[PDB]
Amino acid sequence: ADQQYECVAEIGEGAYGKVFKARDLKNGGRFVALKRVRVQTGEEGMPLSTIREVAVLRHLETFEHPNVVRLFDVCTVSRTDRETKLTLVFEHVDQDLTTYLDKVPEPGVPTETIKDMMFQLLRGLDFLHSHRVVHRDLKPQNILVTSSGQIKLADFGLARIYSFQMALTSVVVTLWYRAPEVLLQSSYATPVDLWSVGCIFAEMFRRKPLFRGSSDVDQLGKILDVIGLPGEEDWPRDVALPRQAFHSKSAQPIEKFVTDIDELGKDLLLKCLTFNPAKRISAYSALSHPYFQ
């Protein structure tokens, strides 16, 4: 394209190149999101990953899942040999979970809306897993919410920095959704995403993040303070930070923080927020949980 899509603003830049907001000139100038990468030619040609990643996106698009953001197009602009400007065009939703949650009136989000969003979230998440794709960076700013109230999973590759008041330290917000296996630099498998679903789930009630760690060792602790120290059987073998590294942790009643959640909600929430990745619920299972009736 690049004459059909007209940029209007740069949103930022991160792991997937620069992100812009543009008008789709062949659909009434409706807003669309673009990702632009400068792909490096090798003596081997086009870089494997570049090819693989675009391949997978294009392919998952075939299925048109309602809970994943649409990929409208792929434009190419070859500069010289060594450079090719690659551009992915996606559907754009001018609102994410964060902008929504911290905008709702005081009572909070309707419990019935929390359920509906949560169901859709696991719907699109189950779709990705079932096609052997792991998101690995499920943060609320990657969760799109249409005015209609529809959930669409994104992945902009854009980090957000949060600065701690008194501490004079900062962190990249994603840390707050990172699963323990990941923090302990142990396994990085699919359950990884369920732990985040659990964090996001809890956040819908709180409208404030559940575990706001300042480092990865700090995060780990913030977690064990609530869920309690796992047993010998549930801690990862041969890992840099042993179970012994964290003193006795009781296990406070989750509702103490995910205020106003219900009995079945609490059940699902803890099945996501389960330390041992192998005993953590699956997107498909969660989906079949009596919370959704």
Binding site: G45, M46, V54, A55, V74
Partner: protein, 233 residues
């Protein structure tokens, strides 16, 4: 119920990768079905030889034939084109992606490393980076499992069926069929009744949700196609 649900969905996508033998004497003009059968077997050689998984050939052939559906390819460059498909296909499927130099070589050095690279860029542009496809080799496992119930043997037959599948694909006629069909048809032709519970075709047909006659037709067709395969230059 993980398996069963992915299968069901893959089936809807499926038709999206269908190709057609009808292209040659018309839209192609310069190329003929037989020239394609030659290029195709050469590709087959390079692969199973340079140690590539069957998937790589299955996909490389799908890209080549999907490409021939929108781009008129000359006789002088048919080969180089088949090579670009091979490169891209292994970059997407082998732990051991075959090298440019390696290809240019087996290609009698008929084309330059740059030129092959320029065809890769070209191939990607005409197909708009849509390089993955549901393959008949991608389905054989799930089916082979519903037949050979247990787990034992599941690997001998899988690799066997998929090798047949690739041979049937060297013939452009095969490309007009759904991945599921080509896949079941292949199973049906090799797997002996002694390694299966309890017919094979009515059993697969039941899974694919198609008619027994439809699957049989596919068997029959693919049987013919596979027979013609012959690596003699």
């Amino acid at each position: 119920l993980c398996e069963d649900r992915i299968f069901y969905n893959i089936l809807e996508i499926e038709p999206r990768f269908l190709t057609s033998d009808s292209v040659f004497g018309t839209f192609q003009q310069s190329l003929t079905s037989h020239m394609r059968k030659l290029l195709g077997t050469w590709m087959f050689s390079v692969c199973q030889e340079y140690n590539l998984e069957p998937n790589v050939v299955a996909l490389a052939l799908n890209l080549l034939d999907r490409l021939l559906l929108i781009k008129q390819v000359s006789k002088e460059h048919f080969q180089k084109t088949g090579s670009a498909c091979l490169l891209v296909a292994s970059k997407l499927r082998s732990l051991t992606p075959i090298s440019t130099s390696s290809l240019c070589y087996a290609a009698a050095d008929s084309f330059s490393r740059q030129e092959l690279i320029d065809q890769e860029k070209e191939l990607l542009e005409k197909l708009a980076w849509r390089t993955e496809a549901v393959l008949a080799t991608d389905v054989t496992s799930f089916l082979l499992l519903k037949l050979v119930g247990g787990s034992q043997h599941l690997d001998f037959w899988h690799h066997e069926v998929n090798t047949l599948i690739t041979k049937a694909l060297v013939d452009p006629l095969t490309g007009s069929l759904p991945a599921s069909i080509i896949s079941a048809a292949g199973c049906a032709l090799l797997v002996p009744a002694n390694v299966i519970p309890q017919g094979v075709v009515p059993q697969l047909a039941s899974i694919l949700g198609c008619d027994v006659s439809v699957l049989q037709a596919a068997v029959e067709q693919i049987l013919t196609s596979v027979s013609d395969f012959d690596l003699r230059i």
